[PDB]
């Protein structure tokens, strides 16, 4: 089966879908590598441990309300122009991990080179590996890119490292699987996709996870056609993940970054990686957000006037304060303690 050289020799490097080093944005760490088959089955369920430890991203909205866990699979769902790529760079810069693996699947060449240029300027550059396939690549190679990125991550997990994996995007990975399946003689099952696709998606997504000694936490991007629209592929991918961050074109338009729609987003490992006090505070802040969106639609289309009802003005100030807290430009790391102090403040505010 199709195999590639992976190891410490690819840290700081750009790989094409065959594992060839086509560029180094930092000098080689060590010439240690081994051949691995890139399309392999997930490990035995009995070989894992639970996702129980939080993965601190330094992003207030995520760490506070959508806390990720070490070994989790997390979706990033976005239409075009929602800041997905900037959020990926933020997660790389601010998360503590031993290794970052980025797989860009069917991305345009310019975007690949821009991503690599960003990595070249990163202070974590020697921990990063980028695997790419452009739109010019055949479908087989595009699938291989995601499999190879996962395989590099598994290599470092086996060395006992904490690895963070990005696959951008699972939409293009699914389309590549579909095209390979069609060209192999398979008939469309749902909305053009053969049934083989819906079985090979979990095969790729179940490979990350935690062990007693290493881990892979994985972020998978999914390209929505528009912010609010009926998408079956996205729903399926969401159904097989441990959570999803929905990015909002509306919030992006307002310059609100990260453009996370908190009420549409969830981390399914939240309860198992947070303290009871944190979970209580997050419940309170979600109740507050739902109350605030209720009042927002209530008066902001019911012709709100700043001064009519002072309770409405209190609510609007609280809404603006929470939005300002969720907004976080790059280079503004928030420690988990500081995030929790903010959560405690807004949970207090839920008592009004």
Binding site residues, Cl ion, CB under 5 A: 154, 157-158, 291
CB nearer to Cl ion: give 107 or 154. 154
Question: Are 21 and 13 spatial neighbours (Cβ–Cβ below 8 Å)?
Answer: yes
Q: Give yes or no for a cis peptide into 225 (omega within 30° of 0).
A: no
Strand runs labelled E in the chain: 3-7, 13-15, 21-24, 33-37, 54-55, 68-69, 73-78, 99-107, 128-134, 162-168, 209-210, 215-223, 243-246, 266-267
Instruction: For the CB of residue 311, give the shortest distance to Cl ion in the complex, in Å.
Output: 8
Instruction: For the CB of residue 209, give the shortest distance to Cl ion in the complex, in Å.
Output: 8
The CA distance from 23 to 12, in Å, is 9
Question: Are 77 and 238 spatial neighbours (Cβ–Cβ below 8 Å)?
Answer: yes
CB nearer to Cl ion: give 203 or 291. 291
CB nearer to Cl ion: give 158 or 280. 158
CB nearer to Cl ion: give 73 or 249. 73
Instruction: For the CB of residue 317, give the shortest distance to Cl ion in the complex, in Å.
Output: 11
Instruction: For the CB of residue 43, give the shortest distance to Cl ion in the complex, in Å.
Output: 6
DSSP 141-186: HHHHHHHHHHHHHHHHHHTT-EEEEEEE-HHHHHHHHHHHHHHTS-
Instruction: For the CB of residue 123, give the shortest distance to Cl ion in the complex, in Å.
Output: 27
CB nearer to Cl ion: give 124 or 291. 291
């Amino acid at each position: 089966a199709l195999s590639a050289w992976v190891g410490y020799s690819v840290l700081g490097a750009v790989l094409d879908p065959t594992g060839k080093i086509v560029e180094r944005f930092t000098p080689e760490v060590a010439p240690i590598s081994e051949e691995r088959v890139i399309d392999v089955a997930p490990p035995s369920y009995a070989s894992r441990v639970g996702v129980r430890e939080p993965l601190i991203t330094g992003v207030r909205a995520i760490d506070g309300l959508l806390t990720c866990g070490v070994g989790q699979r997390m979706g990033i769902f976005a239409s075009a122009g929602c800041g997905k790529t900037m959020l990926m760079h933020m997660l790389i810069e601010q998360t503590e991990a031993d290794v970052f693996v980025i797989g860009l699947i069917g991305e345009r060449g310019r975007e690949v080179t821009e991503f690599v240029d960003m990595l070249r300027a990163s202070h974590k550059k020697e921990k990063c590996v980028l695997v790419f396939a452009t739109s010019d690549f055949p479908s087989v190679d595009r699938c291989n890119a995601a499999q190879l990125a996962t395989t590099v991550a598994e290599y470092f997990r086996d060395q006992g490292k904490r690895v963070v994996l990005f696959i951008d995007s699972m939409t293009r990975y699914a389309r590549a699987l579909r095209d390979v399946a069609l060209a192999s003689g398979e008939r469309p099952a749902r909305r053009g996709y053969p049934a083989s696709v819906f079985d090979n998606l979990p095969r790729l997504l179940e490979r990350p996870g935690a062990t007693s000694e290493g881990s892979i936490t994985a972020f998978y991007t999914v390209l929505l056609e528009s912010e609010e629209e009926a998408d079956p592929m996205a729903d399926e991918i969401r159904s097989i993940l441990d959570g999803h961050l929905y990015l909002s074109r509306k919030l992006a338009g307002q310059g609100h970054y990260p453009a996370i729609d908190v009420l549409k987003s969830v981390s399914r490992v939240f309860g198992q990686v947070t303290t009871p006090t944190h979970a209580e505070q997050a419940s309170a802040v979600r109740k507050l957000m739902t109350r605030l969106e209720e009042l927002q639609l209530f008066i902001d289309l019911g012709e709100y006037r700043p001064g009519e009802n002072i309770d409405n003005d209190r609510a609007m100030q609280m809404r603006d304060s929470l939005k300002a807290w969720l907004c976080q430009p790059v280079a503004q790391y928030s420690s988990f303690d500081d995030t929790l102090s903010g959560m405690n403040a807004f949970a207090d505010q839920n008592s009004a």
